[PDB]
Amino acid sequence: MYVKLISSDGHEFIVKREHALTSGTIKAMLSGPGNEVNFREIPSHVLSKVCMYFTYKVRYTNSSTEIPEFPIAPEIALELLMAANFLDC
Amino acid sequence: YEIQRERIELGRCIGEGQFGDVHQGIYMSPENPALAVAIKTCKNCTSDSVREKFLQEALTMRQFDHPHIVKLIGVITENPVWIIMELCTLGELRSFLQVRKYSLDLASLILYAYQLSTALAYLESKRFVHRDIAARNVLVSSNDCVKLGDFGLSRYMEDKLPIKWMAPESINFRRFTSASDVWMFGVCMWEILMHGVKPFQGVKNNDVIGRIENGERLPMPPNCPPTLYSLMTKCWAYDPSRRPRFTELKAQLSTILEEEKAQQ
Amino acid sequence: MDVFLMIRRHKTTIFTDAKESSTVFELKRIVEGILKRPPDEQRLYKDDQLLDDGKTLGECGFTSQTARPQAPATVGLAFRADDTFEALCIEPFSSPPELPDVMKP
Amino acid sequence: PRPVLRSVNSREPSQVIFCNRSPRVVLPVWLNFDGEPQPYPTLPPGTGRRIHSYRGHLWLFRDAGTHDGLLVNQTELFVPSLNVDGQPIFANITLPVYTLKERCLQVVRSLVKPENYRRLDIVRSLYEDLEDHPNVQKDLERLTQERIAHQRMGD
Ligand SMILES: CNC(=O)c1ccccc1Nc1cc(Nc2ccc(N3CCN(CC(=O)N[C@H](C(=O)N4C[C@H](O)C[C@H]4C(=O)N[C@@H](C)c4ccc(-c5scnc5C)cc4)C(C)(C)C)CC3)cc2OC)ncc1C(F)(F)F
Ligand SMILES: [Ca+2]
């Protein structure tokens, strides 16, 4: 199963459910309702980078191989910190 | 000269001998302050058979008084029987040279060679042949001081006959002289400059003498002054009487040391 | 080798993996599973370059080095409109603010 | 009590290859017999090094510059064991997968002098997170707790 993550500026990010569940906030938003998540305060340049983090995390968690650095450009570092702090990942 | 066992605090075990384990420890005396000591211990307590041969190793070290040979501090004959030695607090040379591989200057490495040369010139003056000169048997008292370790604990533990340290005449004829000590010293100097790499890694003990006899020698260490490698080469003259005396090594090492201090 | 991709159409971005050795056509089968449009209704692009169905992703220049989990490569996607394909149109992501002074040398 | 995370004084030699498979300059840290951390010489990225340790010795690995945590053979602690067939023990040192938040804090820390954290336009909780630098003592506390807890699991 894939999930749709929608940024503040309307960008649709389709990612594997397993990848999205890396974030405890996304996990909490997908369990409670008795799938698609909207983020009014996270813009697309930040949410794209968060999705790259999900890919990275599932690929390299419990790998015996060498793992590369997760790169963060200086320009996005503050917004991405605030995103990670809110998303719990 | 006995010491009062109560003034000895037995510490952690720092090694093993033929006879028993060896421990670090402290010795506070009525005449001087707290002193770090090594305690050799003996498993057996046979009067003439084992207790004699073990107290003999203390007798041997009592003969020597040199700033670069571990001093005997005392013995305890009451059970269990223990020999008390000056502690070299920085432990074994090989481990020390690897730990400080990137932080030790060449001048210090040449100093260690110089100091060992002074102990070996001294041993020759006592008509005493060490037979077990190798980095494994050298101990570090401080950053600027190494010492030959216990003669008893030095035997055949260079790491069985230490073929890769031995002069050809020791391998071929079991001849053991000052001139054969000079060969071993050359190898020990190589060990020091190589930061405690053993000589002839990956070569079988049985093939060493054939390689020696073909004119093969340990190669010039990286960052070894040519004058020093030339001194080592002379120590490894096949013909014992073409080797320098410890006397000449002392003088030439002192000159190479000053030549290095004057450059850095 | 595994390759990590962003498949991008308008304001839509799919995050998916495939192999160097998978074909363009097999990537189109992955898009179909997600966006329910069959391969014959898709065009995939590397920049402006239309990709042939038979080429491997690796042959198109999507490699372990250019398509990483932490830095996926972009594949452009255009669907058939009526009897013709829409033009390749990818909306850029938003841009960050000016770098704060305390984050420069 | 006695520290739970300490080396045992075995004097059983063990040859080890510290392999820095990370892009960080790596500080090997030995826990002595009193469980105190001792720094060893740094390992540049991509460099292996044969080193002499002992069975039952405890090592951990850190970024030399920043003190960020590293894994060794996919875990936090490395314990040399018996050499077998004369085969040296590999210590594969890698980056962990840091949380996105921790990786973000590493990057802001590497760009902003600590005296300037308070000029950044973020909430106070993140100023405090920036100031809570990684350090070995904190990680030893944490690793001790996780070991004490683990040894108490089951009844
Ligand atoms: C001729 N022989 C003898 O006489 C003799 C023989 C045997 C015994 C005693 C003798 N007599 C005397 C001994 C002494 N001193 C002395 C001699 C030896 C010891 N110990 C200490 C305990 N040791 C085991 C251990 O576990 N050692 C650690 C140790 O070695 N460790 C930690 C970890 O496991 C990595 C390993 C590392 O440090 N290894 C080195 C090689 C290393 C270097 C670099 C690296 C790295 S890491 C990144 N880059 C690099 C290059 C990694 C490891 C320690 C505590 C030293 C740090 C056995 C030897 C201590 C000593 O005094 C305090 N003084 C006087 C005497 C006297 F002669 F009786 F008077
Ligand atoms: Ca329990």
Coordinates of C-alpha atoms and ligand atoms in Angstrom, one line a residue, chain B residues 12-17 21-24 37-40 61 69-72 83-102 130 132 136-141 147-155 157, chain D residues 7-12 14 18 26 28 30-33 38-43 49-59 61 80, ligand 1:
Chain B
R12 CA 45.9 -6.2 39.1
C13 CA 47.8 -9.0 37.3
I14 CA 50.0 -7.5 34.4
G15 CA 51.4 -10.8 33.2
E16 CA 52.6 -14.4 33.8
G17 CA 56.1 -16.1 34.3
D21 CA 51.5 -14.6 37.7
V22 CA 53.0 -11.1 37.9
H23 CA 51.0 -8.2 39.6
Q24 CA 51.4 -4.4 39.8
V37 CA 56.2 -1.9 42.1
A38 CA 55.8 -5.2 40.2
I39 CA 55.3 -8.4 42.2
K40 CA 56.5 -11.7 40.7
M61 CA 68.9 -8.7 39.2
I69 CA 67.6 -1.9 34.1
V70 CA 64.6 -2.6 36.4
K71 CA 66.0 -2.6 40.1
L72 CA 65.1 -5.3 42.6
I83 CA 59.9 -10.9 44.3
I84 CA 59.4 -7.0 44.4
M85 CA 60.7 -5.0 41.4
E86 CA 60.6 -1.3 40.3
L87 CA 57.4 -0.8 38.2
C88 CA 57.6 0.8 34.7
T89 CA 54.3 2.6 34.9
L90 CA 53.9 3.1 31.1
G91 CA 54.0 -0.7 30.6
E92 CA 55.6 -2.5 27.6
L93 CA 57.5 -0.7 24.8
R94 CA 55.7 -2.4 21.8
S95 CA 52.1 -1.4 23.0
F96 CA 53.5 2.1 23.9
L97 CA 55.1 2.7 20.5
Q98 CA 51.8 1.8 18.7
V99 CA 49.6 3.9 21.0
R100 CA 52.0 6.9 20.4
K101 CA 52.8 6.0 16.8
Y102 CA 51.5 9.4 15.5
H130 CA 71.6 -11.1 28.0
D132 CA 66.9 -12.0 25.0
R136 CA 58.9 -7.2 23.9
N137 CA 61.4 -7.2 26.9
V138 CA 61.8 -3.4 27.1
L139 CA 59.6 -1.4 29.5
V140 CA 58.7 2.3 29.6
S141 CA 59.2 4.2 33.0
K147 CA 64.5 -0.1 30.8
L148 CA 65.4 -3.7 30.2
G149 CA 62.8 -5.8 32.1
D150 CA 63.2 -8.8 34.4
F151 CA 65.9 -11.2 33.1
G152 CA 63.8 -14.2 34.2
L153 CA 60.6 -13.0 32.5
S154 CA 62.6 -12.0 29.4
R155 CA 63.6 -15.7 28.6
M157 CA 59.2 -14.6 25.2
Chain D
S7 CA 36.8 -4.3 30.3
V8 CA 37.7 -7.6 32.1
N9 CA 41.5 -8.0 32.8
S10 CA 41.8 -11.3 30.7
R11 CA 45.3 -10.8 29.1
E12 CA 44.1 -13.2 26.3
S14 CA 43.0 -10.6 20.3
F18 CA 39.3 -1.3 13.1
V26 CA 36.6 8.1 14.2
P28 CA 38.1 4.6 19.3
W30 CA 38.4 1.8 25.4
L31 CA 36.5 1.3 28.7
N32 CA 39.2 0.4 31.2
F33 CA 38.8 -2.0 34.2
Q38 CA 40.2 6.2 27.3
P39 CA 40.7 7.8 23.9
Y40 CA 42.9 6.0 21.3
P41 CA 44.4 7.5 18.1
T42 CA 41.9 8.7 15.4
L43 CA 41.0 6.7 12.2
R49 CA 44.2 -0.6 11.0
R50 CA 45.4 -3.8 12.7
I51 CA 45.4 -3.2 16.5
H52 CA 46.2 -5.4 19.6
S53 CA 43.4 -5.8 22.2
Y54 CA 42.2 -8.7 24.5
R55 CA 39.1 -11.0 24.9
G56 CA 36.4 -9.2 26.9
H57 CA 37.7 -5.6 26.3
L58 CA 34.9 -3.0 25.7
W59 CA 35.3 -0.4 22.9
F61 CA 33.4 4.7 18.5
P80 CA 37.1 -8.8 20.9
Ligands
LIG1 C1 60.8 -8.6 30.5 N1 59.4 -8.6 30.9 C2 59.0 -8.4 32.1 O1 59.8 -8.0 33.0 C3 57.5 -8.5 32.4 C4 56.8 -9.4 31.6 C5 55.4 -9.5 31.9 C6 54.8 -8.8 32.9 C7 55.6 -8.0 33.8 C8 57.0 -7.8 33.5 N2 57.7 -7.1 34.4 C9 57.5 -5.7 34.7 C10 56.5 -5.0 34.1 C11 56.4 -3.7 34.4 N3 55.4 -2.9 33.7 C12 54.3 -3.2 33.0 C13 54.4 -4.2 32.0 C14 53.2 -4.7 31.5 C15 51.9 -4.2 31.9 N4 50.7 -4.8 31.4 C16 49.5 -4.0 31.6 C17 48.3 -4.8 31.3 N5 48.4 -5.4 30.0 C18 47.1 -6.0 29.6 C19 46.1 -5.0 29.0 O2 44.9 -5.3 28.9 N6 46.7 -3.8 28.6 C20 45.9 -2.7 28.1 C21 46.1 -2.7 26.6 O3 47.1 -2.9 26.1 N7 45.0 -2.4 25.8 C22 43.6 -2.0 26.2 C23 42.8 -2.3 24.9 O4 42.5 -3.7 24.9 C24 43.8 -2.0 23.8 C25 45.2 -2.5 24.4 C26 46.2 -1.5 23.8 O5 46.4 -0.4 24.3 N8 46.9 -2.0 22.7 C27 47.8 -1.2 22.0 C28 48.8 -2.1 21.3 C29 47.1 -0.3 20.9 C30 47.8 0.7 20.3 C31 47.3 1.4 19.3 C32 46.0 1.2 18.9 C33 45.3 2.1 17.9 S1 43.7 2.4 18.0 C34 43.9 3.5 16.6 N9 45.0 3.6 16.1 C35 45.9 2.7 16.8 C36 47.3 2.6 16.3 C37 45.2 0.2 19.5 C38 45.8 -0.6 20.5 C39 46.4 -1.4 28.8 C40 46.0 -1.4 30.2 C41 47.9 -1.3 28.7 C42 45.8 -0.1 28.1 C43 49.5 -6.4 30.0 C44 50.8 -5.6 30.2 C45 51.9 -3.2 32.8 C46 53.1 -2.7 33.4 O6 53.2 -1.7 34.3 C47 52.0 -1.0 34.7 N10 57.3 -3.0 35.1 C48 58.3 -3.7 35.7 C49 58.5 -5.0 35.5 C50 59.6 -5.7 36.1 F1 60.5 -6.2 35.2 F2 59.3 -6.8 36.8 F3 60.3 -5.0 36.9

